Design an enzyme around this catalytic site. Structure first.
Site, PDB file in Angstrom:
ATOM      1  CG  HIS A 354      52.991 -16.384  23.657  1.00  0.00           C
ATOM      2  ND1 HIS A 354      54.188 -16.204  22.988  1.00  0.00           N
ATOM      3  CD2 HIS A 354      52.332 -17.354  22.992  1.00  0.00           C
ATOM      4  CE1 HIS A 354      54.247 -17.037  21.965  1.00  0.00           C
ATOM      5  NE2 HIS A 354      53.117 -17.751  21.947  1.00  0.00           N
ATOM      6  CE  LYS A 560      58.623  -2.001  21.145  1.00  0.00           C
ATOM      7  NZ  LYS A 560      58.763  -3.412  20.696  1.00  0.00           N
ATOM      8  NE  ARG A 561      49.738  -5.161  21.639  1.00  0.00           N
ATOM      9  CZ  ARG A 561      50.462  -6.128  22.231  1.00  0.00           C
ATOM     10  NH1 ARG A 561      50.853  -6.006  23.491  1.00  0.00           N
ATOM     11  NH2 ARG A 561      50.808  -7.213  21.553  1.00  0.00           N
ATOM     12  CE  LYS A 566      53.506  -3.740  23.570  1.00  0.00           C
ATOM     13  NZ  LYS A 566      54.148  -5.073  23.486  1.00  0.00           N
ATOM     14  CB  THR A 672      59.425 -11.112  17.037  1.00  0.00           C
ATOM     15  OG1 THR A 672      58.142 -10.792  17.573  1.00  0.00           O
ATOM     16  CG2 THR A 672      59.706 -12.576  17.283  1.00  0.00           C
ATOM     17  CE  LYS A 676      59.815  -9.470  12.116  1.00  0.00           C
ATOM     18  NZ  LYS A 676      58.483  -8.989  12.472  1.00  0.00           N
TER      19      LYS A 676
END
Lengths: 830, 830
Positions: A354, A560-561, A566, A672, A676
């Site tokens: 990953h 997200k985190r 990010k 991911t 969506k």
């Protein structure tokens, strides 16, 4: 075939005869458990029907191992797949409830955290929907990771409460326990074999979480382990002597294994716990698997046959120990010869990497792993020698200088002597990812680009030795949950305009809308479904954030985190600017320049990530100042949704307009959330990394806002910074001085803005090119503004996002895994 | 009305749809839980039917509070009362089982220890059988007290495992939680009232154990409390920092409350825990009761009405705090005036004393109780002043010297200044029993003699002040469990010869056998039922002890706590002698002199009661030497049944010939075991104390072996010893020197025999007159020998034991409590 009336009977029956409350009235909490257990009756019939067949047929079965599954709420999807959403919602009306208020109750089952989990979850959905014999194995976390509280001070963390009353889904198998062992020593029997005794013994007990498939009977398991001690291990002598703590040592050590997901590992203790967590998941799972093999075999037990019946997929570097373990079993207990065993291991185990950056791959302390798993450490020294002697057989030793580069990269043991060598205090470590490539028959990345990064950067030398290993399996997310269930008014549009329901399965038909994206009827239906979905969010927001927003604005989501990389700091900076400009305006001018917006932020920081927390703090202060500025009105709102999770997502996504994925380009391995967001018609804005690529592509370049530097540039742009060659934009400094002015509370963010400035320093000089990407970003946001003003255009852009998703169905991703790694065929369940 | 077929369906249903095992085959463990949950379906219908009526009618209800209930196995009795023993045993045959093998599985639910428990249990049986609105309240013990292992070294203790898989009976009410508090401080609000804040807060959660009545729908509760903490009290910050222990402190303190029954209290810690245990049981229970009152009241809430609706019975000095608690509630929360409240308290609370000797009555540390319950300690200083000022109002102060004797005896505060006084470092303590007399409207002993000892010794001054308080309620044990269920072949004899079944209820009809005790047909039937019951025991014994015994010998049972004062040492000495004599004999002579015997010993020692343990050790060594002496054959066997409990008893009793209760006369307050033994035709041998009296009487003097000194003599006989005026028997020294010879293993018992010798010393000089009673005892055993040889006589003696029991039905004892203390009438449940 159950009818609404039969269901009502079931709900009543459980409400009274297997209760967890007082018998007075039928309040929501009771109403849920009753409804849930009513469902679980059905789930079991199938779980058994399925179990029998998998058992009698004795075909191959796959076993997806993961430190985390992020299952979320089981209820709606369970009833959805069963095709009973309608009987259940009617039976609940009979009992004076409605389905959505009943679903409200269920907590998100907190057994995971990130995509890593959510993937693994999505996968199980598919695996069962498509009738593929495979289970998931995981730890059963008591307190999840944590729950997020958003307060005046920012994020606070409190242990999850999901098992407070207990879970109505899980089915405890008390006759399914396996012994686990830590510490102790090894010694050689006079029969030959090695014997590992001593240390600590504990137990691991199976809890089965059923997973049903869409429109099928195939119902598989997510078997979670729970660690404990037999009662006899309670020290009466001591408890009665006064020492209460001392008496509980045994079960307290044995239980804490399953307390929280990713325990803090700064201290030696945290490390040992981490390791225990892993080894448990491994040994327990394997043991159970082997047992199922042996049982299914009968008299004709052929160990030859093992890999032909079983496949174990290590979801990242965590379940690594599956390798030295399965070996230990097949050697010390099953008594087979080293090679025969090693063959079976390689042919069963598979890796799914990953990570992008060599350093995110997990490395252990020798003396630690030594002291905890000393039988395994021997098997790992043997697999390191098998490697050292095959790197000597290939390449040779004409070069010497290149045989040393090859060995340094690929050896599982870091900082060791070689065995027999030619050449005439750095702490000993074990590389896990290295061990994962060596043992497994397959290695896979999670996106085209990434899967190439693994071949041509991460695992180069290895790639050249065994290029036959390397694969790709691009990520996907299940449409049942992420379309059909979480977004019904779209799901109706989809069923109508494609002409059947079959798209839930045959997700390709999503593309049939390409031809209608111009249509005005479908456009109106589409814009109506998207409001409808937003109306629900206005309420949730009011509730959890304490802010009232209009539904007639763009919903701009970054969930997200919370990490520097990010770059939430970027989104918000983007807001801060758009604001500042608003202020230096008139009323006439403002409405003209900007579109009405609600910028939604979500996700969890670390605990001791000082900065990550200072950001959420910022975001909330910003929102505060803005939302209650009287000049801004409903033209702009900035909220922070607390405790982001599966459910939160199931509500935000079906109602997004724009979704940001703006991480420093090239660092992200897939993604991911976007997949969506895409499916639900949300228009994405992002840098060219991970999935952003594959989505943009599949949906159309003119249907995805791109910006900022790209992968290649980053080294150079960091060089420019490093040499004092970066010149900031003047709008960037405009925002920065505006924050130092104190326009967002009295909270001082001087240390926040600190990490953006300088040329060098571990926590200085804007390592993530927020300054650099800022201009290109905010420019890109003007383009979003422009795009939204053209509603016909915007709606089309949306319709196409949906049409171009169908390749991100987990159905596809699994089919690929199922066919090209595990070698498993379908099983029909009559 | 369920039929065997309907039941089979129920068992299947649960076996699959609410399971705790793997779905493969129907093994015993699964078969139990399935069967048990099938029962519990029925139990609930009634528990609800009952709950509704008690709720709607709003009549008075009673609340039996006890630190221990000794419920034993629920299964057989549950189905017995339901009148389904036959449908269930047939449905289990259908599923390839038999009932007794299914019952085998169930563990004894370990929530108690001694008679104190077993009484409380028996009572609940009655209370429900007879339709009397009353619940039991207790703590829900995880690990009971302990399980006994009998080994080469003697007794070992291991924590109980009864909740290992969980209990299939209990019904958890998660909406029933009450807050408990410890430590902290008190302060006065500007409204007037006092406010107790700070310290620790924990929760107590209800688990209902149903109790059904014989041949009735009336199904009441044994609501057990479980102590815990809300999840939020888990320290994430610390757990992740590494300190795992530190993080669990909260729930570990909160949970340990319900771990074990009677925790060791030598250390300060043990004491605080004990106290917590108590206060919890009290506050939790009361809170729940008050809540039920308030609810049932509606608008018309009259606090006046409280004692007219509620009655709380403190089973011994444990639940004492009910008093200062109910006061605190009615003062600080309900806001009533001191007197009004105190009135309601007295009129609701009642004491049931169990102890003979002033010193067995519990006394607390002030500074301890102060620091733990500081609001209660104030209420206890106020009840001590109310007393000091009414002892001044009565008697007066003409005497002064007698007003000081009266105050010293009766004051609740030991070692204090008086308030306002006339008279011109010993540690402060709180006497609980004193506080119990002062607060309660009723005080009761447990036997004629005892109830007089309380009036005329234990609580004299008090008796004279309020003689209207003192009562008696002689103990009884339920015939359902202890006859109808545990001994079926007798139960058939009983039903036949009385002509109906109605005797299970109308236990008086037991006496109708008086007229048949001569009959030879009934004699044969009787001797046949008693073998039959013994045959089962031969097996159990072989199993648990590892000894094969004949069924054609006298079964001589001494099962009760292993204490010097119960004098097991006496029974065994009795054996040792009968043996020694055997050895100095011939084969001809032996058979002539002694009858074939199996002397069964049972029960648990302390942990740190060095001697008690040295005894069990002895008994086992003796047995060893004997059972494997080849000359002895089957003429004598001595075993020790490990882990005596309800079930063990349910098997030994129906198959006893003789039962010993040979405790140093006058020390025993009642006894329950005998009452059973009696009912099952067992012939008792005992000293004249406790029940021994009332049994002997009711059954006939010529139906009960008596021996040894009596109550009066003991002071004098201890004086004789104390002055060097005791001359031992020469058979006593014969046994003593025989043990010092080493005839029973190499284990040295010199320190055992030590405690028998001398004139003075805390652990010397045979304080319990084993030497003195020895002759009279062993002589009395010759008389048993004689009696058994006459089988016709013996059988008659047996039949009469049964005929004369009927007044020891708990039915009677309760009726008495129900009518003469609580004031509760029946409730029919249609």
């Amino acid at each position: 075939a159950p009818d609404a009336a039969s269901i009502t009977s079931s709900i009543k029956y459980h409400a009274e005869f297997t209760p967890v409350f007082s018998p007075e009235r039928f309040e929501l909490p009771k109403a849920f458990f009753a409804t849930a257990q009513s469902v679980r009756d059905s789930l079991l019939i199938n779980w058994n029907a399925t179990y029998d067949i998998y058992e009698k047929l004795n075909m191959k079965q796959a076993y997806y191992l993961s430190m985390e599954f992020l299952q979320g709420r089981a209820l709606l999807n369970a009833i959805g797949n069963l095709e009973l959403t309608g009987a259940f919602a009617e039976a609940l009306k009979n009992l004076g409830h409605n389905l959505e208020n009943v679903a409200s109750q269920e907590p998100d089952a907190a057994l995971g955290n990130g995509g890593l989990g959510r993937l693994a979850s999505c996968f199980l959905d598919s695996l069962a929907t498509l009738n593929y014999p495979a289970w998931g194995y995981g730890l059963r976390y008591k307190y999840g990771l944590f729950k997020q509280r958003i307060t005046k001070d920012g994020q606070e963390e409190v242990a999850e409460d999901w098992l407070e009353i207990g879970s109505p889904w899980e089915v405890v198998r008390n006759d399914v326990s396996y012994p686990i062992k830590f510490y102790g020593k090894v010694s050689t029997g006079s029969d030959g074999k090695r014997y590992w005794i001593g240390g600590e013994d504990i137990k691991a007990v199976a809890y089965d979480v059923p997973i049903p498939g869409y429109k099928t009977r195939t119902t598989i398991s997510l078997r979670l382990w729970s660690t404990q001690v037999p009662s006899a291990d309670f020290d009466l002598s001591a408890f009665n002597a006064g020492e209460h703590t001392k008496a509980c040592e045994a079960q307290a050590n044995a239980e804490k294994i399953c307390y929280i997901l990713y325990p803090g590992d700064e201290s030696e203790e945290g490390k040992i716990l981490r390791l225990k967590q892993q080894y448990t998941l491994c040994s327990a799972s394997l043991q159970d698997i082997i047992s199922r093999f042996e049982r299914r075999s009968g008299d004709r037990i052929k160990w030859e046959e093992f890999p032909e019946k079983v496949a174990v997929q290590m979801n990242d570097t965590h379940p690594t120990l599956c390798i030295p373990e399965l070996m230990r079993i097949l050697i010390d207990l099953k008594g087979l010869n080293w090679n025969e065993a090693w063959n079976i291991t390689q042919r069963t185990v598979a890796y799914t990497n990953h990570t992008v950056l060599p350093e995110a791959l997990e490395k252990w302390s020798y003396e630690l792993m030594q002291k905890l798993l000393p039988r395994h450490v021997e098997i790992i020294e043997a697999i390191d020698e098998e490697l050292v002697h095959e790197i000597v057989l290939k390449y040779g030793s004409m070069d010497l200088n290149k045989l040393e580069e090859k060995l340094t990269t690929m050896r599982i043991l870091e900082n060791f002597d070689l065995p027999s060598s030619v050449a005439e205090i750095p702490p000993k470590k074990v590389r896990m990812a290295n061990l994962c490539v060596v043992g497994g028959h397959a290695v896979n990345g999670v996106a085209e680009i990434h899967s190439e990064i693994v071949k041509e950067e991460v695992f180069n030398d290895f790639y050249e030795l065994w290029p036959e290993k390397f694969q790709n399996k691009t990520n996907g997310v299940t449409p049942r949950r992420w379309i059909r269930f979480c977004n019904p008014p779209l799901s109706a549009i989809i069923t109508k305009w494609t002409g059947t329901e079959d798209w839930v399965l045959k997700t390709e038909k999503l593309a049939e809308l390409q031809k209608f994206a111009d249509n005005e009827d479908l456009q109106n239906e589409w814009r109506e479904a998207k409001r409808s979905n937003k109306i629900k969010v206005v309420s949730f927001l009011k509730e959890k954030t304490g802010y009232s927003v209009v539904p007639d604005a763009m919903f701009d989501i970054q969930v997200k985190r919370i990490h520097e990389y990010k770059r939430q700091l970027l989104n918000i900076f983007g807001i801060v600017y758009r604001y500042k400009k608003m202020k230096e305006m008139t009323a006439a001018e403002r409405k003209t320049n900007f579109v009405p917006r609600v910028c939604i932020f979500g996700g969890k920081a670390f605990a001791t990530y000082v900065q990550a927390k200072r950001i959420v703090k910022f975001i909330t202060d910003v929102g505060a100042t803005i939302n209650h500025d009287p000049e801004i009105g409903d033209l702009l709102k900035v909220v922070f949704v607390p405790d982001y999770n599966v459910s939160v997502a199931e509500l935000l996504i079906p109602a997004s307009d724009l979704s940001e994925h703006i991480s420093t380009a090239g660092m992200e391995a897939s993604g991911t959330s976007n997949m969506k967001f895409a499916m639900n018609g949300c228009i994405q804005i992002g840098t060219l990394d991970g999935a952003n690529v594959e989505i943009r592509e599949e949906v159309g370049e003119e249907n995805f806002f791109l910006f900022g530097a790209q992968a290649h540039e980053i080294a150079g742009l960091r060089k420019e910074r490093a040499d004092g060659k970066f010149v900031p934009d003047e709008r960037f400094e405009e925002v920065k001085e505006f924050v130092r002015s104190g326009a967002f509370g009295s909270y001082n963010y001087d240390d926040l803005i600190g990490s953006l400035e300088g040329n060098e320093g571990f926590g200085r000089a804007d390592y993530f090119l927020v300054g650099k990407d800022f201009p290109s970003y905010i420019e890109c946001q003007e383009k979003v503004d422009e795009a939204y003003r053209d509603q016909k255009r915007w709606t089309t852009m949306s319709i196409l996002n949906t049409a171009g998703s169908y390749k991100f169905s987990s159905d596809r991703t699994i089919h690929e895994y199922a066919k090209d790694i595990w070698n498993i065929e379908a099983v029909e369940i009559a």
